[PDB]
Amino acid sequence: PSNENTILSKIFYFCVLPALSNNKACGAGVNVKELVLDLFYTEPFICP
Amino acid sequence: EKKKQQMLTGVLGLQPTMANHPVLGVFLPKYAKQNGGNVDKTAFRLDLIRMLALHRLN
Numbered sequence: 761p762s763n764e765n766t767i768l769s770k771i772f773y774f775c776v777l778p779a780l781s782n783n784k785a786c787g788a789g790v791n792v793k794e795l796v797l798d799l800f801y802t803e804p805f806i807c808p
Numbered sequence: 809e810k811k812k813q814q815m816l817t818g819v820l821g822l823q824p825t826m827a828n829h830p831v832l833g834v835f836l837p838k839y840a841k842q843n844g845g846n847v848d849k850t851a852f853r854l855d856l857i858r859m860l861a862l863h864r865l866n
Contacts, residue, residue, distance in 0.1 A: 796850055799857050806826040 812836050815843050819852050831856075831863045 761769060777785065816822050816836060826832060839852055 793850065796854055796857075800820055800853050803853075803857060803860070804820055804822065804826070806829055 811844075812840050815839050815852070818843070818849055819856060831860050835859060 813827075816827055816832075819839070822832070827836065835856070839855075843849075843852060
């Protein structure tokens with residue numbers, strides 16, 4: 761993200777999503793390891 | 809060979825049938841010259857994930 765794209769990212773995140781959200785959003789992260797474990801649960805079968 | 813097999817069981821507990829797979833057959837020797845360090849066990853699982861994915865681009 762250059763000057764323009766950084767500006768547009770802040771434009772959305774401070775104007776468009778807030779005003780249309782009306783303070784209703786949440787924001788956080790999913791777990792960083794249990795996704796890897798889900799991938800491992802899909803992986804151990806190697807048949808085509 | 810024991811180091812290779814130990815790392816194979818540490819990665820996922822993969823079966824030898826999957827050890828014969830080409831992506832495994834090429835990368836198990838490189839995973840041998842590592843994991844003797846403190847690096848991780850999870851990193852190797854994710855590495856195998858993304859490499860197996862790179863392999864299968866129809």
